[PDB]
């Protein structure tokens, strides 16, 4: 268990205590009164389970936090609504993305398949050809290893199916790639992996989601926020322009969506004139677009036409 390049700044949280006490008040950045004093005392419960349980290994989660906290009185927790703030505070003060501190979350960043072997390190006490579900990057992204890179492109897809069938037919061999499914919004495990390859490998990465804005936001949750990105990436996923010409069945959209379309525009977050152009198409067409729908035009179709077709004209 490493975590010292951080355990250092994790103790440095304290230090700004005496140097803070001996001379004057004790504001961070705000302390001094009731909710700002208590919110602090809980510093303790914090730097207590951490620095003293970093060299003894064991790692735990949020709704456990709410429990290992029922120990330190005059500091316990009334609701698991605390876990965030504090832990989310740590991310800001000790400049250490949550996990670094030895925290596991709610979910499992499984689903990944491609040509590149690797190992991790801790916990104990191939990636080219493991199994089907194979590797499930778990609650961490800094326990690494590499040395094997015979694929020149990574793949971002979402579906308890499209990815699945993108396995059978494949793509993993005569078409490079590195597969990684995501299941809805991709948080830590996953993302910090996407990024880890878009910086330490110079290897591209594209997103392939359905049409619903609920997918077009999954690129933005990897595009930036909401250490967790890959900004230089593009979306070869179902873009409003790559379906007008590709026949494909459709479906009617509702109220919650149209109010979601004026939100990814009347709020310019990564709102380039190219995600603004294809989006404008959404306003027009006035219809949705599943992701596995290609199956309508041939089963061996996705694995043949769309992907490559759209993949040669990078942009």
């Amino acid at each position: 268990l490493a975590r010292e390049k951080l355990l250092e700044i994790a103790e440095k949280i304290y230090n700004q205590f005496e140097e803070e006490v001996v001379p004057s008040v004790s504001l961070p950045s705000s302390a001094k009164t009731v909710k700002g004093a208590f919110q602090l005392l809980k510093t303790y419960a914090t730097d207590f389970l951490i620095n003293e349980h970093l060299a003894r290994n064991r790692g735990s989660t949020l709704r456990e936090l709410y429990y290992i906290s029922e120990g330190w009185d005059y500091a316990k927790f009334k609701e698991q609504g605390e876990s965030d703030r504090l832990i989310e505070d740590l991310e800001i003060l000790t400049s250490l993305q949550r996990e670094y501190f030895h925290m596991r979350p709610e979910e499992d960043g499984a689903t990944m398949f491609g040509p590149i072997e690797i190992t991790e390190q801790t916990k104990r006490g191939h990636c080219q050809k493991v199994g089907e579900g194979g590797y499930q990057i778990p609650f961490n992204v800094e326990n690494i290893e590499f040395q094997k890179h015979d694929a020149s492109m990574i793949i971002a897809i979402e579906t308890g199916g499209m990815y699945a069938r993108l396995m059978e037919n494949g793509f993993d061999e005569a078409y490079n790639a590195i597969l990684v499914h995501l299941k809805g919004q991709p948080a830590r495990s996953t993302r910090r992996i996407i990024k880890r390859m878009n910086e330490e490998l110079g290897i591209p990465v594209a997103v392939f989601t359905d049409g619903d804005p609920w997918s077009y936001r999954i690129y933005a949750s990897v595009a930036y926020g909401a250490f967790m990105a890959t900004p230089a990436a593009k979306f070869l996923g179902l873009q409003p322009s790559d379906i007008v010409e590709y026949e494909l069945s459709t479906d009617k959209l509702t109220e919650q969506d149209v109010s979601a379309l004026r939100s990814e525009l009347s709020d310019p977050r990564f709102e380039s004139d190219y995600w603004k152009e294809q989006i404008q198409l959404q306003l027009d067409i006035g219809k949705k677009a599943e992701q596995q729908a290609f199956a309508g035009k041939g089963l061996d179709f996705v694995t043949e036409v769309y992907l490559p077709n759209r993949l040669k004209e990078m942009g």
Binding site: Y14, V21, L41
Partner: peptide
């Protein structure tokens, strides 16, 4: 009255820990 039975154990948590 509580930021005086709070400010207390705090700088006492910063001990059995540093």
């Amino acid at each position: 009255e509580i930021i005086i039975t709070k400010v207390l154990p705090k700088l006492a948590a910063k001990v059995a820990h540093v």
